[PDB]
């Protein structure tokens, strides 16, 4: 289901900006989980370009230079 499918992600910032933050941060704390900003909402959090519109061309350039 969509609330369990959104809480079960490989990215703890999305699952923290959604429902319960305590359980998500403790599970990602003891697991040592490592987000890589992976899409839209983590980049809205951290203050950079969305990888959707014009920022999609910017992210293809940034990933090609990796």
């Amino acid at each position: 289901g969509i609330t369990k499918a959104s809480l079960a992600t490989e990215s703890f910032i999305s699952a923290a900006s959604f429902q319960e933050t305590t359980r998500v941060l403790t599970e990602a704390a003891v697991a040592g989980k490592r987000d890589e900003l992976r899409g839209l909402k983590e980049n809205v959090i951290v203050g950079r370009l969305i990888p959707a519109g014009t920022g999609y061309a910017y992210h293809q350039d940034r990933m090609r230079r990796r």
């Binding site: 969509i2 959104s6 999305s14 959604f18 992976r38 899409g39 839209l40 909402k41």
Partner: protein
Amino acid sequence: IETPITANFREGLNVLQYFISTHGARKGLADTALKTANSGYLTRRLVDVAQDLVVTEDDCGTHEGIMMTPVIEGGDVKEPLRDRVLGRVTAEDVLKPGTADILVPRNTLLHEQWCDLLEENSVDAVKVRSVVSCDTDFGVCAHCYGRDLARGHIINKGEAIGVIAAQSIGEPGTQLTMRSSIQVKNKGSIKLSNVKSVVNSSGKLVITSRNTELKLIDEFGRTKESYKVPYGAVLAKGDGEQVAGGETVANWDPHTMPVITEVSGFVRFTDMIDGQTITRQTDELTGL
């Protein structure tokens, strides 16, 4: 209320009729309040489960898509083929029933001219490429999505479709609500699906299956009526036959589950010991 409001707003309404109108009106207002309260949270959960899905390639390179047929509740056809297979890339290339003659190639966006050419030849089921059966790792390719809705051409490489999808589903959530036989209408050939039938003594065709689905194939190929047929129902017709309109072709009992047979012979009791397995209950006021 069994005594209705026999007065309109051009004339007056006396006190009780206006009070009953107030029952209805305040029920509606409280529905709208708590309705908005649920609708906003539905939009939130949908844009937070989608959230990430970006059109990130241009061709996945698979074939398996879903099968689009017009929906048939059992009356008029509610949603036709033109309004479902409008602008979505075909899975297997559609061959007209002049078999080994291709009508559309297998990567053609079906815009309005192609949909009219589908409606003319009365195409059965245009198997079409869906987002759920894609192959792109970490995203969704462009051809399996379809037309860019709100525009005309194919979807651009990049437009975040999870967010527009979740808003398009949750946005009419404000408008939503919160709190015997088979009668035919049209005329055509008769189709049966998933049936185990046998011949009775009367000459009809009786059924030994719950999973029977009756269909009305029309003159050009598609289906305009579908009926779930119960277990042990009795048909006045058979498969592949021809009927007329207004003709009830099936009848059963919704109260009784019939245990009808296949072979013709005597009836005996096996592992039926009286007093324990079967009891003696005489029907008092009837006799049988």
